[PDB]
Amino acid sequence: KVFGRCELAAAMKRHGLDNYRGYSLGNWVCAAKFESNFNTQATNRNTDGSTDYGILQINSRWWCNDGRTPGSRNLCNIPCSALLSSDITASVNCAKKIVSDGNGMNAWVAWRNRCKGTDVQAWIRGCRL
Ligand SMILES: [Au+]
Numbered sequence: 001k002v003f004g005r006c007e008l009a010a011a012m013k014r015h016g017l018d019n020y021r022g023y024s025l026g027n028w029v030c031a032a033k034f035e036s037n038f039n040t041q042a043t044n045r046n047t048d049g050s051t052d053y054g055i056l057q058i059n060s061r062w063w064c065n066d067g068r069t070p071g072s073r074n075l076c077n078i079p080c081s082a083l084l085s086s087d088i089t090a091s092v093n094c095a096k097k098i099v100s101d102g103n104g105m106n107a108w109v110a111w112r113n114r115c116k117g118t119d120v121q122a123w124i125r126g127c128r129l
Pocket of ligand 1: 015090092
């Protein structure tokens with residue numbers, strides 16, 4: 001499923017991401033935009049052999065089991081395939097663990113390089129939340 005901007009904003013807010021560990025909703029919508037273009041089905045392979053999954057491109061090196069990432073963890077205790085559902089529950093609940101692990105949203109390279117230090121407020125501009 002490809003979300004609209006305000007659609008993903010509303011769903012993320014319902015799933016408790018608004019100001020989770022201090023990251024306003026706009027940070028999360030900005031991250032999703034530049035990770036997946038709001039597409040729950042987004043997959044991209046890392047050079048190390050790991051693969052990134054879903055709306056927030058959660059990586060199989062640490063967070064999920066794709067069955068082909070040797071010497072890797074499943075710290076969200078899920079199949080990576082569950083990160084590609086039209087229901088963002090699994091991506092959201094795993095992202096809450098990732099952002100809690102001490103590095104915050106810097107774990108999302110696209111957030112660091114494209115959202116960090118910008119008018120992230122702009123991503124929820126006009127939305128009924
Ligand atoms: Au959730």
